[PDB]
């Protein structure tokens, strides 16, 4: 709010005022020049139309973990907006905002606590955003046509930084196109998009090989074992702040569709990933079905697993599958 | 210890035998759950009057408990000709704490049985103000066919027979 | 209470507007100044502290010049004014077992 | 029950004609034909029998 | 105008209180039912009525029956003044309720916002999480001790803390009130919770639900747990936001138009709520036929055979179902011992056989009697065990199909497939009829008599012939002695058996050939062994004496050594022996007891005996 | 001529006539006056066709209670992500989740009033934010200031709901968390906006306060919400007569048993003997219960287990296709006491709330459940209590219920080593309980 | 004050317990034992003013029981003129006995 206007229907007069801070106050009927100072006041109320309103958004800041000290953690800060660079940040943006200081009153529990304390906040002016077909782009497309070299060339592309291992360089760049299957029109929904997984126990750390192919690839959300489990794989409801709570908070399959899955450490918190992965290799049922709802949504996306063995190496002279814990997952 | 509401402390609530002065509890043949509580009764002997400290106030309360029971041994009473050690599962030191192994035993007798059985059948057949008094006597009779100091006196002079 | 000496009468307010004129007032904050306000709790070298008892602490009130030079872990040593601060015993009625005399170190 | 696992699926045959035509659209001359696939069963021989060294 | 309106409908009730109400002369129904309805109350005095709907409608053929609905919610004190004045002018510390019943149609809980506010709307469902029992007001006396606090004040509305309406003398008014106890009746209520039944719910869509105070005499008559009806007025209720110490969603939007009472500015909200009055729970020559059929003569071999149409032949297992079924003495020693209160009866068998149709029948067939299968045996159930810390307790009673066998026989298979703990536990609830539990929090000592009923499996499938049953119980050794016998079922591929069983089946699953008759139904035998259960037959003969040589005949035979058999027939079993001979002569209704009805005891425990013996 | 009070306009016609242009771009403009009008119109031109056959429906009780309009599909949005503050007054489209609801609270849309003389039954209007209130007696000549009394309890209310929403998350750039918006319904729109469905909402704008301090009128970062003119989903049977000539010809057709053979099968390879058994289990007799004795029931239960991958599943997919209400199972989403008995703690009361089982939300369908040789054995447990008595009994400190279950079951198992392994009992390779092998 | 729950005996079971209030008196105090199973003999009053938290306000009042006695666990509940009080008090005549 930045303007207000009460209107009173007997003199029609609309009392302007400038808004002050979070919290204020209406006035009286009895303050006008017509529809006061008789034996009949005009008993005002609010207009919505007539009351022009601005935007506004808030966000927090924290700091590059570079120019850290070694001591302590980093601390957050708040910002505003006002005008229109509204609707202009994002959460995971390496930017900078320039703008002016001001710090603010509290104006509650000020007697006992809340002495001289002045939780500031910076208002913000300008943001100077960093690091972002047949459309001035086809001298590049050109550029594979012309020298064609599909097989091998653009298998030298991806991941360059090892040592051998063609066949499986190959192997992953076909799945990183897709396409639709088959166009079934009628009620017949088959399977797309199969996964590869991955097995044995590389020096070389495996993990940097296989995910650094999944930060460059399109859409495809990097995960591990800790933290979004088969459980919290899909979407729950959780706590949130004062704000509307009780939100559909997600894992990493509801937001990465028709993507890379690239997953790693798949003997880590089985009791729920075990469900997790059958779920999506069942065509279209990840859903939640908790005691909130019962909506189930979409599954697309393909699945690139790492197992590692048991103790030291696999013994290839003994049986497999001594290490990997799902046979029906695996061998049908 | 049970433990607090929110604005309470962790305190101290008794279960069985700080309630139980001068009584009774059983241990005759849990098989699972014998070497779960075994470690905490043979000590309310040994360590007469015994309190522990489990993440709490390091106190020790007082006890002086009495304890019967009524084991059970693995099959028949005669399971072997060889020995106790043999026949219970207890082992030798928590057993040892008692005083005496009272043991039971008939494999065949005429007359004690009907001892038993004539005994047996006639305890079946147990089955306003003077009328008040006079099912009293009536009470007072059919506990009396020999008289053997009944129950209304004799529980009596027991507790100050202890005190 | 940061002055560390004077118990001067206490202006509980926050920012007053409307001087004795009919002018709307403002604030120039370029010229206002501010300062800082950190509060930590020491806890007991548990060395040369005999063993009868767990560590004890207090704490301190200290300013802009030292701060961030705390690290937690950090064998410190530190001087100042012994203060006490707050209302005891009339601020509330009836007040029972209650102390209203906090240890305070406004230091340097 | 030694090294090799799987009993010929027609879940491995209809994903056999899934990486053709992945393949078929990566490198798209508009030759869906033998050798194409001729390509494909190139990847499945290899992918297995990896343990057999 | 509508003053006289509400003059109009009470005396035209009062009328209807003074015709007939009665179609019928003298084939039953006695003419003017409601001044019987007067004359019951006058015995009883329990201060109620109960009127229905239907002969209010057939009285004015819809003239008053539909303006009731729309009067009432406001003329609550219409309806009572009249029939406070007609008991007057009729009968001689009177508080009255007015309770209608069965209208027509019922609604679901889904159906309620607009029309329905000062309603009558039956509404059906189940309940859940009921309260205790605490006092309402309605009227007090209280008033200021100024000068005289001696005023009956009016309005104990939601908000009755404040009696300040007429002072008695020119004095001060509202300055105080003293609510005494001891001029102001009083009546008792819980606020329960119900919910929306199962054959309607379309979705699981988080099934709403609300909230319903019930105030007469319907206190603690919904059990918490059956699908049930009630009477329909519709009420809306506020917080007046009273002296006490307080005053996501916009809630209350509606309550911002609600503010500027002459009180304090607040915003006072609302939430739809309903009031109760009456409860239900839907989910002779008859005495004379009693006395008739106590004076038959093969009443013994007429309810052997009237059972179960659902099993053909073995009339042993069906003279021991009956026995289980009635009960027999439970009353002993003077001070100490309570002996068993029943006999328990199991049969083991081959499954999917005949083993399975008793079990199905006696489930809806006895009071009560409840059934479990027993494979849950960690978390709770038959092993009886404590829940955790919920909303403020620890250590809780918990439920178990065990503990719930008051006047009820338990019935509880697959003795084999639960673990060893449990095996002891029931075998301390099988020789008294207590169980104890002093698992993390006080003892407890719960006293449930019971009569239990099992079906385990053989080790095999099919039971050994040449050897004994040591082998085949499957169970241990105790156990099998604190038991009585198990008549074990047999079978055979005979071809002449499975024919005539072919054709005992097949008229069984037709959709009507109810050819067979049993000379019982299932209530007129119900009531029967509910006139058999009252009596207390006691042996006076000498037949003691012939009681005594026969188990000293018998347990010399099953000790057939030094060092054989430990199935040695202790003197536990007197007991049993004894107490079925007192079951069967309450079968056929004699006191006393013969020296001839024990005789079929004995062979009863001899044929059980052959089947214990090789 | 069936008396109903709600006309769903296109409203997408104005666009598409050469006048009311004006009128257009008022209703995306004022839209709350414009349907006021509109509303007037309707029921007049309801008399003008009333005047003309003076036979219709006694021309007094269609002219009395009142109609409504509702404009729908008008122009088009595209999410959440564009709600601009000038947008105060307008139609908005969204397209959307419902997630939760709320019972109906009532609405101040009439009051009452009575002071203490003998009789006054007043009925002030409100109409507004604030209720009017008189400060002199009544009924009277001669009555002081009296104290006026709320008889609450006596005045009418209707309906309303608030329903919390969320945008379906479409082409969202896969860092942004999908947020929150609610509703207001006053008509009888009410139980029909059940939480759980894809939503198409045509409504307009509007802003509330808020007060700041719980027990002051002090308040100013405002919430909005929207109110729904008219909604949409988006995405006994009324038994005709043609319906059954035409299956009466197919139920004369001596084909019925291969061509309902043939038409279960799409796609599906022939396997002709599990055809019977999948048919004839949707077709699952009746309920041939006795007065006394008896209760028997005609249900089956099929099952299957052998060979991988033999569309083991869609099979059982295309069964749920066909079936309008029945259940389908997880895997572990389930357990012992996952399935009923719930002491849930709910995020609008904290309380108890018993919700069933999925075996009796089949009532009225078959049970499809699966992965039976990994089910665990602290369950498998009730499935026996339910293939004999067709209940579920409760052993909770809550309730004790003996509810029953009208549902039928399929099976569907899998092998352990590679195979049905045969020349071999294969009974031993599915190990399974020979109790319910009855 | 010691606030007191139904002894799970002699209730029909599978459900809940209930709660009241017991205030006691001044020679009655620490009698009891935080776990064993009494008896009260006390009156029925019934004073608050009318205010209470857990639920709304409402014309409603709340139980107190003040205890006059208090006896322990009494066994075999079968009796009819005696053993319902541990009278046990021996002077003239049973003491001489």
Same mark, same amino acid.
């Given at each position: 709010?930045?303007?207000?206007?009460?209107?009173?229907?007997?003199?029609?007069?609309?009392?302007?005022?400038?808004?002050?801070?979070?919290?204020?106050?209406?006035?009286?009927?009895?303050?006008?020049?017509?529809?006061?100072?008789?034996?009949?006041?005009?008993?005002?109320?609010?207009?919505?139309?007539?009351?022009?309103?601005?935007?506004?958004?808030?966000?927090?800041?924290?700091?590059?973990?570079?120019?850290?000290?070694?001591?302590?953690?980093?601390?957050?800060?708040?910002?505003?907006?006002?005008?229109?660079?509204?609707?202009?940040?994002?959460?995971?943006?390496?930017?900078?905002?320039?703008?002016?200081?001001?710090?603010?009153?509290?104006?509650?529990?000020?007697?006992?606590?809340?002495?001289?304390?002045?939780?500031?906040?910076?208002?913000?002016?300008?943001?100077?955003?960093?690091?972002?077909?047949?459309?001035?782009?086809?001298?590049?497309?050109?550029?594979?046509?012309?020298?064609?070299?599909?097989?091998?060339?653009?298998?030298?592309?991806?991941?360059?930084?090892?040592?051998?291992?063609?066949?499986?360089?190959?192997?992953?760049?076909?799945?990183?196109?897709?396409?639709?299957?088959?166009?079934?029109?009628?009620?017949?929904?088959?399977?797309?998009?199969?996964?590869?997984?991955?097995?044995?126990?590389?020096?070389?750390?495996?993990?940097?090989?296989?995910?650094?192919?999944?930060?460059?690839?399109?859409?495809?959300?990097?995960?591990?074992?800790?933290?979004?489990?088969?459980?919290?794989?899909?979407?729950?409801?959780?706590?949130?702040?004062?704000?509307?709570?009780?939100?559909?908070?997600?894992?990493?399959?509801?937001?990465?569709?028709?993507?890379?899955?690239?997953?790693?450490?798949?003997?880590?918190?089985?009791?729920?990933?075990?469900?997790?992965?059958?779920?999506?290799?069942?065509?279209?049922?990840?859903?939640?079905?908790?005691?909130?709802?019962?909506?189930?949504?979409?599954?697309?996306?393909?699945?690139?697993?790492?197992?590692?063995?048991?103790?030291?190496?696999?013994?290839?002279?003994?049986?497999?599958?001594?290490?990997?814990?799902?046979?029906?997952?695996?061998?049908? | 210890?049970?433990?607090?509401?929110?604005?309470?402390?962790?305190?101290?609530?008794?279960?069985?035998?700080?309630?139980?002065?001068?009584?009774?509890?059983?241990?005759?043949?849990?098989?699972?759950?014998?070497?779960?509580?075994?470690?905490?009764?043979?000590?309310?002997?040994?360590?007469?009057?015994?309190?522990?400290?489990?993440?709490?106030?390091?106190?020790?309360?007082?006890?002086?408990?009495?304890?019967?029971?009524?084991?059970?041994?693995?099959?028949?009473?005669?399971?072997?000709?060889?020995?106790?050690?043999?026949?219970?599962?207890?082992?030798?030191?928590?057993?040892?704490?008692?005083?005496?192994?009272?043991?039971?035993?008939?494999?065949?007798?005429?007359?004690?049985?009907?001892?038993?059985?004539?005994?047996?059948?006639?305890?079946?057949?147990?089955?306003?103000?003077?009328?008040?008094?006079?099912?009293?006597?009536?009470?007072?009779?059919?506990?009396?066919?020999?008289?053997?100091?009944?129950?209304?006196?004799?529980?009596?002079?027991?507790?100050?027979?202890?005190? | 209470?940061?002055?560390?000496?004077?118990?001067?009468?206490?202006?509980?307010?926050?920012?007053?507007?409307?001087?004795?004129?009919?002018?709307?007032?403002?604030?120039?904050?370029?010229?206002?100044?501010?300062?800082?306000?950190?509060?930590?709790?020491?806890?007991?070298?548990?060395?040369?502290?005999?063993?009868?008892?767990?560590?004890?602490?207090?704490?301190?009130?200290?300013?802009?010049?030292?701060?961030?030079?705390?690290?937690?872990?950090?064998?410190?040593?530190?001087?100042?004014?012994?203060?006490?601060?707050?209302?005891?015993?009339?601020?509330?009625?009836?007040?029972?077992?209650?102390?209203?005399?906090?240890?305070?170190?406004?230091?340097? | 029950?030694?090294?090799?696992?799987?009993?010929?699926?027609?879940?491995?045959?209809?994903? @056999?004609?899934?990486?053709?035509? $992945? &393949?078929?659209?990566? #490198?798209?001359?508009?030759?869906?034909? @033998?050798?194409?696939?001729?390509? $494909? &069963?190139?990847?499945? #021989?290899?992918?297995?029998?990896?343990?057999?060294? | 105008?509508?003053?006289?309106?509400?003059?109009?409908?009470?005396?035209?009730?009062?009328?209807?209180?003074?015709?007939?109400?009665?179609?019928?002369?003298?084939?039953?129904?006695?003419?003017?039912?409601?001044?019987?309805?007067?004359?019951?109350?006058?015995?009883?005095?329990?201060?109620?009525?109960?009127?229905?709907?239907?002969?209010?409608?057939?009285?004015?053929?819809?003239?008053?029956?539909?303006?009731?609905?729309?009067?009432?919610?406001?003329?609550?004190?219409?309806?009572?003044?009249?029939?406070?004045?007609?008991?007057?002018?009729?009968?001689?510390?009177?508080?009255?309720?007015?309770?209608?019943?069965?209208?027509?149609?019922?609604?679901?809980?889904?159906?309620?916002?607009?029309?329905?506010?000062?309603?009558?709307?039956?509404?059906?469902?189940?309940?859940?999480?009921?309260?205790?029992?605490?006092?309402?007001?309605?009227?007090?006396?209280?008033?200021?001790?100024?000068?005289?606090?001696?005023?009956?004040?009016?309005?104990?509305?939601?908000?009755?803390?404040?009696?300040?309406?007429?002072?008695?003398?020119?004095?001060?008014?509202?300055?105080?009130?003293?609510?005494?106890?001891?001029?102001?009746?009083?009546?008792?209520?819980?606020?329960?919770?119900?919910?929306?039944?199962?054959?309607?719910?379309?979705?699981?869509?988080?099934?709403?639900?609300?909230?319903?105070?019930?105030?007469?005499?319907?206190?603690?008559?919904?059990?918490?747990?059956?699908?049930?009806?009630?009477?329909?007025?519709?009420?809306?209720?506020?917080?007046?936001?009273?002296?006490?110490?307080?005053?996501?969603?916009?809630?209350?939007?509606?309550?911002?138009?609600?503010?500027?009472?002459?009180?304090?500015?607040?915003?006072?909200?609302?939430?739809?709520?309903?009031?109760?009055?009456?409860?239900?729970?839907?989910?002779?020559?008859?005495?004379?036929?009693?006395?008739?059929?106590?004076?038959?003569?093969?009443?013994?071999?007429?309810?052997?055979?009237?059972?179960?149409?659902?099993?053909?032949?073995?009339?042993?297992?069906?003279?021991?179902?009956?026995?289980?079924?009635?009960?027999?003495?439970?009353?002993?020693?003077?001070?100490?011992?309570?002996?068993?209160?029943?006999?328990?009866?199991?049969?083991?068998?081959?499954?999917?056989?005949?083993?399975?149709?008793?079990?199905?029948?006696?489930?809806?067939?006895?009071?009560?009697?409840?059934?479990?299968?027993?494979?849950?045996?960690?978390?709770?159930?038959?092993?009886?065990?404590?829940?955790?810390?919920?909303?403020?307790?620890?250590?809780?009673?918990?439920?178990?199909?065990?503990?719930?066998?008051?006047?009820?026989?338990?019935?509880?298979?697959?003795?084999?497939?639960?673990?060893?703990?449990?095996?002891?536990?029931?075998?301390?609830?099988?020789?008294?009829?207590?169980?104890?539990?002093?698992?993390?929090?006080?003892?407890?000592?719960?006293?449930?008599?019971?009569?239990?009923?099992?079906?385990?499996?053989?080790?095999?499938?099919?039971?050994?012939?040449?050897?004994?049953?040591?082998?085949?119980?499957?169970?241990?050794?105790?156990?099998?002695?604190?038991?009585?016998?198990?008549?074990?079922?047999?079978?055979?591929?005979?071809?002449?058996?499975?024919?005539?069983?072919?054709?005992?089946?097949?008229?069984?699953?037709?959709?009507?050939?109810?050819?067979?008759?049993?000379?019982?139904?299932?209530?007129?035998?119900?009531?029967?062994?509910?006139?058999?259960?009252?009596?207390?037959?006691?042996?006076?003969?000498?037949?003691?004496?012939?009681?005594?040589?026969?188990?000293?005949?018998?347990?010399?035979?099953?000790?057939?050594?030094?060092?054989?058999?430990?199935?040695?027939?202790?003197?536990?079993?007197?007991?049993?022996?004894?107490?079925?001979?007192?079951?069967?002569?309450?079968?056929?209704?004699?006191?006393?007891?013969?020296?001839?009805?024990?005789?079929?005891?004995?062979?009863?425990?001899?044929?059980?005996?052959?089947?214990?013996?090789? | 001529?069936?008396?109903?009070?709600?006309?769903?306009?296109?409203?997408?016609?104005?666009?598409?006539?050469?006048?009311?242009?004006?009128?257009?771009?008022?209703?995306?403009?004022?839209?709350?006056?414009?349907?006021?009008?509109?509303?007037?119109?309707?029921?007049?031109?309801?008399?003008?066709?009333?005047?003309?056959?003076?036979?219709?429906?006694?021309?007094?009780?269609?002219?009395?209670?009142?109609?409504?309009?509702?404009?729908?599909?008008?122009?088009?949005?595209?999410?959440?992500?564009?709600?601009?503050?000038?947008?105060?007054?307008?139609?908005?489209?969204?397209?959307?989740?419902?997630?939760?609801?709320?019972?109906?609270?009532?609405?101040?849309?009439?009051?009452?009033?009575?002071?203490?003389?003998?009789?006054?039954?007043?009925?002030?209007?409100?109409?507004?934010?604030?209720?009017?209130?008189?400060?002199?007696?009544?009924?009277?000549?001669?009555?002081?200031?009296?104290?006026?009394?709320?008889?609450?309890?006596?005045?009418?209310?209707?309906?309303?709901?608030?329903?919390?929403?969320?945008?379906?998350?479409?082409?969202?750039?896969?860092?942004?968390?999908?947020?929150?918006?609610?509703?207001?319904?006053?008509?009888?729109?009410?139980?029909?906006?059940?939480?759980?469905?894809?939503?198409?909402?045509?409504?307009?704008?509007?802003?509330?306060?808020?007060?700041?301090?719980?027990?002051?009128?002090?308040?100013?970062?405002?919430?909005?919400?929207?109110?729904?003119?008219?909604?949409?989903?988006?995405?006994?049977?009324?038994?005709?007569?043609?319906?059954?000539?035409?299956?009466?010809?197919?139920?004369?057709?001596?084909?019925?048993?291969?061509?309902?053979?043939?038409?279960?099968?799409?796609?599906?390879?022939?396997?002709?003997?599990?055809?019977?058994?999948?048919?004839?289990?949707?077709?699952?007799?009746?309920?041939?219960?006795?007065?006394?004795?008896?209760?028997?029931?005609?249900?089956?239960?099929?099952?299957?287990?052998?060979?991988?991958?033999?569309?083991?599943?869609?099979?059982?997919?295309?069964?749920?296709?066909?079936?309008?209400?029945?259940?389908?199972?997880?895997?572990?989403?389930?357990?012992?006491?996952?399935?009923?008995?719930?002491?849930?703690?709910?995020?609008?009361?904290?309380?108890?709330?018993?919700?069933?089982?999925?075996?009796?939300?089949?009532?009225?369908?078959?049970?499809?459940?699966?992965?039976?040789?990994?089910?665990?054995?602290?369950?498998?447990?009730?499935?026996?209590?339910?293939?004999?008595?067709?209940?579920?009994?409760?052993?909770?400190?809550?309730?004790?219920?003996?509810?029953?279950?009208?549902?039928?079951?399929?099976?569907?198992?899998?092998?352990?080593?590679?195979?049905?392994?045969?020349?071999?009992?294969?009974?031993?390779?599915?190990?399974?309980?020979?109790?319910?092998?009855? | 004050?010691?606030?007191?729950?139904?002894?799970?005996?002699?209730?029909?079971?599978?459900?809940?317990?209930?709660?009241?209030?017991?205030?006691?008196?001044?020679?009655?105090?620490?009698?009891?034992?935080?776990?064993?199973?009494?008896?009260?003999?006390?009156?029925?009053?019934?004073?608050?003013?009318?205010?209470?938290?857990?639920?709304?306000?409402?014309?409603?009042?709340?139980?107190?029981?003040?205890?006059?006695?208090?006896?322990?666990?009494?066994?075999?509940?079968?009796?009819?003129?005696?053993?319902?009080?541990?009278?046990?008090?021996?002077?003239?005549?049973?003491?001489?006995?």
């Amino acid at each position: 709010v930045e303007v207000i206007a009460y209107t009173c229907d007997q003199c029609g007069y609309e009392v302007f005022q400038e808004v002050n801070s979070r919290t204020f106050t209406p006035l009286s009927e009895c303050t006008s020049e017509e529809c006061s100072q008789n034996q009949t006041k005009g008993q005002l109320f609010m207009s919505t139309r007539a009351s022009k309103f601005s935007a506004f958004q808030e966000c927090k800041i924290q700091e590059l973990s570079q120019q850290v000290p070694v001591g302590h953690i980093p601390r957050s800060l708040n910002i505003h907006v006002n005008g229109t660079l509204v609707r202009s940040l994002s959460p995971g943006d390496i930017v900078d905002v320039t703008g002016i200081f001001l710090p603010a009153p509290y104006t509650g529990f000020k007697a006992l606590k809340a002495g001289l304390l002045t939780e500031t906040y910076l208002e913000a002016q300008f943001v100077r955003q960093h690091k972002k077909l047949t459309s001035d782009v086809e001298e590049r497309v050109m550029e594979l046509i012309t020298s064609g070299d599909v097989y091998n060339r653009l298998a030298k592309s991806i991941a360059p930084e090892i040592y051998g291992n063609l066949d499986v360089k190959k192997a992953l760049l076909l799945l990183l196109v897709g396409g639709v299957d088959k166009r079934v029109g009628d009620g017949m929904k088959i399977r797309g998009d199969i996964n590869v997984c991955l097995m044995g126990d590389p020096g070389v750390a495996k993990s940097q090989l296989l995910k650094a192919i999944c930060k460059i690839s399109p859409r495809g959300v990097y995960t591990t074992g800790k933290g979004s489990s088969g459980v919290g794989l899909t979407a729950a409801v959780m706590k949130d702040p004062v704000t509307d709570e009780m939100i559909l908070e997600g894992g990493a399959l509801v937001l990465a569709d028709n993507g890379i899955c690239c997953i790693d450490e798949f003997d880590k918190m089985d009791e729920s990933d075990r469900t997790a992965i059958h779920e999506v290799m069942e065509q279209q049922t990840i859903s939640i079905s908790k005691a909130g709802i019962n909506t189930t949504l979409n599954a697309r996306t393909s699945i690139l697993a790492a197992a590692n063995p048991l103790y030291g190496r696999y013994n290839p002279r003994l049986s497999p599958l001594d290490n990997i814990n799902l046979p029906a997952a695996l061998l049908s | 210890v049970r433990k607090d509401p929110i604005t309470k402390e962790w305190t101290l609530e008794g279960g069985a035998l700080v309630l139980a002065d001068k009584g009774v509890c059983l241990i005759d043949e849990f098989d699972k759950m014998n070497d779960q509580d075994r470690t905490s009764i043979h000590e309310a002997m040994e360590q007469q009057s015994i309190s522990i400290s489990k993440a709490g106030i390091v106190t020790t309360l007082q006890a002086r408990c009495s304890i019967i029971a009524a084991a059970n041994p693995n099959g028949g009473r005669y399971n072997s000709t060889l020995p106790l050690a043999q026949n219970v599962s207890l082992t030798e030191p928590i057993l040892s704490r008692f005083d005496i192994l009272c043991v039971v035993r008939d494999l065949v007798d005429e007359e004690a049985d009907e001892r038993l059985a004539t005994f047996v059948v006639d305890s079946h057949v147990r089955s306003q103000l003077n009328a008040r008094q006079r099912r009293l006597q009536r009470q007072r009779k059919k506990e009396e066919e020999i008289s053997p100091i009944p129950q209304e006196l004799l529980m009596k002079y027991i507790h100050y027979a202890r005190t | 209470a940061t002055t560390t000496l004077t118990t001067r009468i206490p202006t509980p307010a926050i920012y007053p507007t409307e001087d004795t004129e009919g002018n709307k007032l403002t604030t120039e904050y370029g010229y206002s100044t501010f300062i800082d306000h950190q509060r930590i709790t020491v806890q007991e070298m548990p060395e040369m502290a005999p063993a009868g008892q767990l560590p004890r602490s207090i704490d301190v009130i200290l300013d802009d010049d030292l701060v961030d030079k705390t690290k937690p872990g950090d064998r410190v040593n530190v001087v100042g004014v012994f203060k006490s601060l707050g209302a005891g015993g009339m601020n509330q009625s009836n007040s029972n077992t209650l102390i209203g005399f906090k240890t305070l170190i406004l230091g340097n | 029950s030694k090294f090799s696992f799987g009993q010929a699926t027609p879940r491995t045959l209809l994903g @056999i004609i899934r990486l053709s035509q $992945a &393949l078929a659209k990566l #490198r798209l001359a508009d030759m869906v034909d @033998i050798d194409d696939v001729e390509e $494909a &069963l190139r990847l499945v #021989r290899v992918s297995k029998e990896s343990l057999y060294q | 105008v509508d003053d006289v309106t509400g003059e109009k409908v009470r005396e035209a009730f009062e009328q209807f209180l003074e015709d007939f109400s009665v179609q019928s002369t003298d084939t039953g129904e006695v003419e003017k039912v409601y001044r019987a309805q007067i004359e019951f109350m006058k015995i009883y005095d329990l201060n109620t009525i109960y009127i229905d709907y239907q002969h209010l409608s057939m009285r004015e053929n819809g003239a008053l029956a539909m303006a009731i609905s729309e009067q009432y919610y406001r003329f609550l004190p219409f309806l009572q003044k009249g029939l406070r004045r007609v008991v007057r002018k009729y009968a001689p510390e009177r508080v009255f309720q007015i309770s209608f019943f069965n209208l027509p149609t019922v609604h679901r809980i889904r159906d309620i916002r607009s029309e329905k506010i000062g309603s009558l709307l039956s509404i059906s469902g189940t309940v859940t999480r009921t309260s205790e029992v605490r006092p309402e007001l309605y009227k007090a006396s209280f008033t200021c001790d100024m000068c005289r606090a001696i005023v009956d004040n009016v309005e104990q509305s939601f908000k009755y803390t404040e009696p300040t309406f007429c002072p008695n003398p020119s004095c001060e008014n509202r300055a105080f009130w003293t609510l005494n106890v001891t001029r102001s009746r009083f009546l008792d209520w819980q606020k329960v919770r119900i919910q929306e039944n199962a054959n309607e719910i379309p979705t699981g869509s988080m099934p709403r639900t609300l909230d319903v105070i019930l105030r007469g005499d319907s206190v603690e008559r919904a059990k918490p747990g059956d699908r049930c009806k009630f009477t329909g007025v519709e009420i809306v209720v506020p917080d007046v936001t009273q002296l006490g110490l307080p005053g996501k969603t916009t809630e209350g939007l509606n309550s911002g138009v609600t503010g500027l009472r002459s009180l304090g500015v607040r915003d006072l909200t609302y939430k739809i709520s309903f009031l109760a009055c009456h409860v239900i729970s839907i989910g002779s020559d008859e005495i004379n036929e009693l006395k008739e059929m106590v004076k038959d003569e093969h009443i013994y071999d007429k309810l052997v055979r009237s059972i179960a149409p659902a099993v053909f032949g073995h009339e042993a297992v069906k003279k021991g179902i009956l026995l289980q079924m009635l009960g027999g003495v439970h009353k002993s020693t003077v001070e100490g011992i309570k002996l068993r209160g029943d006999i328990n009866i199991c049969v083991v068998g081959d499954p999917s056989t005949s083993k399975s149709q008793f079990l199905k029948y006696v489930v809806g067939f006895a009071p009560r009697s409840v059934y479990t299968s027993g494979k849950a045996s960690s978390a709770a159930g038959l092993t009886a065990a404590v829940v955790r810390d919920e909303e403020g307790g620890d250590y809780t009673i918990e439920a178990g199909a065990l503990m719930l066998a008051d006047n009820g026989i338990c019935c509880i298979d697959e003795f084999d497939k639960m673990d060893i703990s449990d095996q002891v536990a029931i075998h301390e609830a099988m020789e008294q009829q207590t169980i104890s539990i002093a698992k993390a929090g006080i003892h407890a000592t719960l006293n449930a008599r019971t009569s239990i009923l099992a079906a385990a499996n053989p080790v095999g499938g099919r039971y050994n012939r040449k050897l004994s049953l040591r082998g085949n119980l499957n169970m241990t050794a105790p156990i099998m002695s604190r038991f009585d016998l198990f008549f074990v079922i047999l079978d055979d591929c005979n071809e002449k058996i499975d024919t005539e069983l072919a054709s005992h089946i097949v008229d069984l699953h037709m959709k009507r050939d109810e050819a067979i008759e049993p000379p019982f139904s299932a209530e007129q035998l119900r009531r029967y062994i509910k006139y058999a259960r009252t009596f207390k037959p006691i042996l006076t003969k000498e037949a003691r004496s012939y009681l005594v040589e026969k188990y000293k005949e018998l347990r010399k035979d099953d000790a057939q050594g030094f060092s054989r058999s430990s199935y040695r027939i202790t003197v536990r079993q007197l007991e049993s022996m004894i107490r079925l001979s007192e079951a069967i002569a309450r079968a056929n209704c004699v006191d006393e007891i013969t020296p001839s009805f024990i005789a079929e005891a004995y062979d009863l425990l001899r044929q059980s005996i052959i089947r214990v013996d090789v | 001529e069936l008396g109903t009070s709600n006309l769903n306009l296109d409203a997408r016609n104005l666009l598409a006539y050469k006048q009311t242009e004006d009128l257009y771009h008022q209703l995306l403009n004022y839209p709350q006056e414009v349907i006021s009008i509109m509303d007037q119109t309707i029921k007049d031109c309801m008399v003008s066709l009333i005047v003309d056959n003076n036979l219709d429906y006694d021309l007094d009780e269609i002219e009395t209670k009142f109609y409504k309009v509702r404009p729908y599909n008008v122009g088009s949005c595209k999410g959440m992500r564009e709600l601009n503050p000038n947008d105060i007054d307008k139609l908005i489209n969204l397209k959307g989740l419902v997630l939760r609801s709320t019972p109906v609270i009532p609405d101040m849309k009439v009051a009452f009033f009575k002071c203490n003389v003998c009789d006054h039954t007043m009925a002030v209007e409100i109409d507004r934010g604030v209720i009017q209130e008189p400060a002199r007696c009544e009924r009277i000549d001669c009555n002081e200031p009296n104290s006026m009394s709320l008889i609450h309890n006596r005045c009418s209310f209707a309906d309303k709901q608030v329903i919390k929403l969320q945008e379906t998350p479409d082409f969202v750039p896969d860092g942004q968390t999908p947020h929150s918006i609610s509703l207001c319904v006053y008509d009888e729109l009410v139980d029909s906006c059940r939480a759980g469905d894809r939503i198409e909402v045509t409504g307009t704008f509007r802003s509330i306060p808020i007060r700041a301090n719980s027990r002051q009128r002090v308040l100013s970062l405002y919430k909005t919400y929207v109110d729904v003119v008219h909604v949409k989903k988006v995405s006994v049977r009324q038994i005709t007569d043609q319906d059954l000539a035409k299956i009466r010809e197919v139920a004369a057709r001596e084909d019925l048993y291969s061509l309902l053979a043939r038409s279960i099968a799409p796609s599906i390879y022939e396997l002709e003997d599990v055809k019977k058994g999948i048919l004839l289990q949707l077709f699952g007799g009746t309920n041939k219960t006795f007065t006394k004795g008896g209760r028997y029931r005609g249900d089956i239960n099929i099952l299957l287990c052998g060979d991988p991958s033999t569309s083991k599943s869609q099979i059982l997919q295309y069964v749920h296709k066909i079936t309008p209400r029945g259940v389908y199972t997880s895997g572990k989403g389930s357990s012992a006491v996952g399935l009923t008995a719930y002491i849930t703690r709910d995020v609008d009361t904290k309380q108890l709330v018993l919700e069933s089982g999925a075996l009796v939300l089949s009532d009225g369908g078959v049970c499809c459940i699966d992965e039976f040789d990994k089910m665990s054995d602290s369950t498998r447990s009730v499935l026996h209590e339910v293939m004999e008595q067709q209940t579920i009994s409760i052993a909770k400190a809550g309730i004790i219920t003996t509810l029953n279950a009208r549902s039928s079951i399929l099976a569907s198992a899998n092998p352990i080593g590679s195979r049905y392994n045969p020349n071999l009992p294969v009974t031993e390779n599915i190990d399974l309980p020979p109790p319910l092998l009855s | 004050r010691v606030t007191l729950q139904e002894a799970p005996g002699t209730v029909p079971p599978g459900r809940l317990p209930r709660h009241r209030e017991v205030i006691l008196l001044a020679d009655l105090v620490d009698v009891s034992k935080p776990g064993e199973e009494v008896e009260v003999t006390g009156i029925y009053k019934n004073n608050y003013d009318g205010n209470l938290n857990a639920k709304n306000g409402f014309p409603v009042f709340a139980t107190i029981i003040e205890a006059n006695s208090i006896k322990r666990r009494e066994g075999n509940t079968a009796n009819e003129g005696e053993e319902g009080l541990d009278v046990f008090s021996w002077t003239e005549e049973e003491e001489r006995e």
